[PDB]
Structure 1
Amino acid sequence: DIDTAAKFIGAGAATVGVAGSGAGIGTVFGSLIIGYARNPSLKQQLFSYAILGFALSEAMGLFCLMVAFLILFAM
């Protein structure tokens, strides 16, 4: 069958969307180091941004894994 062969290239291409949430977490936790070394008195508030920014970045990255596990198995 070819669909079983197309679902593999369909999934193995969807997981490339994770390459965005891997360079987007290095820019959030990389801008916490630059932002905290300047004003280290806001560590408990700059952090609570680097968690919102890290959750809204892996979210758009786990969609491409949910899509992969939606093409590969679940129709």
Structure 2
Amino acid sequence: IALAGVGLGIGTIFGNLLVACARQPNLTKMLFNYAILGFALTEAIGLFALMLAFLMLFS
């Protein structure tokens, strides 16, 4: 269930990203890099939850 708050978060980021890219087309690279950074940071939490699930499923 933790992943529910992870995937949604990713969407949020990308959501805002599009809006930003709409009003600053010439600053797309930095926005995309920051969006990737945020996605990886959230994926860290996702992997923590996944590791707990695997520990409780395979042991």
**5+ residue gaps, structure 1:** 1-15
Give the number of the structure with larger relative contact order, counting CA–CA contacts within 8 Å between residues 6 or more apart: 1
Note the alpha carbon deviations across 1:7-66, whole angstroms, 9 max, x for none: xxxxxxxxx111011110001111110111010101111000000011011211121111
More helix by share: 2
Q: TM-score, normalised by structure 2?
A: 0.91
Please give the alpha-carbon distance, in whole angstroms, between the structure 2 residues aligned to 1:41 and 1:27. Answer: 22
RMSD of aligned alpha carbons = 0.9
The equivalent of 1:61 in structure 2 is: 46
For structure 2, the 5+ residue unaligned runs are none
Please say if residues 21 and 61 of structure 1, whose CA atoms lie closer than 8 Å, have aligned partners that are also in contact: yes
- 1:28 aligned residue (13, 18, 29): 13
Q: Which moved more, 1:58-67 or 1:24-33?
A: 58-67
Residue 52 of structure 1 aligns with which residue? 37
Normalising by structure 1, we get a TM-score of 0.73
